[PDB]
Amino acid sequence: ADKELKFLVVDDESTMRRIVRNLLKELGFNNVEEAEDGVDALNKLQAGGYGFVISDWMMPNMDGLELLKTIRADGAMSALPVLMVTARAKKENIIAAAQAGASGYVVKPFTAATLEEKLNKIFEKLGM
Ligand code: BEF
Ligand SMILES: [Mn+2]
Numbered sequence: 137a138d139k140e141l142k143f144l145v146v147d148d149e150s151t152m153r154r155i156v157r158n159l160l161k162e163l164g165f166n167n168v169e170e171a172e173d174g175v176d177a178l179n180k181l182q183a184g185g186y187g188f189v190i191s192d193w194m195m196p197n198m199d200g201l202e203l204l205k206t207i208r209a210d211g212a213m214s215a216l217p218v219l220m221v222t223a224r225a226k227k228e229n230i231i232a233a234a235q236a237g238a239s240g241y242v243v244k245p246f247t248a249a250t251l252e253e254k255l256n257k258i259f260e261k262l263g264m
Contacts, residue, residue, distance in 0.1 A: 137264045142167040142185050146177045146200065147192035147221070152244075156190055156221065159251050174198025178206060181213060193222035193229070201232060208237040217258050221246065 143165060145156045153170045160168050169186075171177035173195040180186070189207065193200040200220060207213045220233050223244040230241055239261070240254045258264075 137165075137259045138187075139164045140167055141165060141187045141264075142169070143188045143190060144169055144171055144177060144180055144186050145190050146171045146174070146195070146203065148172055148195040149192075152192065152221075156251070159248055162248070163252060163255070174200060174203035174206070177203055181207070181216075186216065189216055189218045190221055191218060193220060193224045193233070201236060204233060204236050204238060217262060217264075219254060219258060221251075 143160055145153050145160070145168060147153045147156070157168050157170065169180055171180050175197040177189070177191070178198070181189075191200040191203055198206070200222065204218050204220070207216050207218060217239045218237070219240045219242065220238045221242045221244065222229075225243050233241055239258045242250055242254050
């Protein structure tokens with residue numbers, strides 16, 4: 137994928153956003169911004185320019201399932217790639233997110249290899 141792709145990394149834990157941003161940097165992506173919840177994320181997204189979202193689920197203000205649904209319903213954002221990266225592990229959770237339009241789903245804790253693999257899986261699917 138284009139190394140100028142602009143990422144939005146969303147999680148209410150600074151430590152997890154830091155993991156994800158440093159992983160992206162290793163993969164060659166430096167155009168990366170952070171958001172602390174679904175509302176914060178939508179503000180950044182409405183500001184424009186974003187090509188990929190990586191999002192947690194459990195967050196105050198607006199959770200990641202609601203954030204995914206909001207993105208998928210919005211005509212200006214509807215095809216935006218959204219990778220869920222979450223501790224939510226039940227099959228029912230994966231189903232709700234997949235059916236809501238998740239591009240991919242990674243369960244915490246995850247390895248560097250898993251993130252790279254699942255990001256590349258989305259790039260291939262979308263022809264990026
Ligand atoms: F708080 Be997240 F869904 F890992
Ligand atoms: Mn969380």
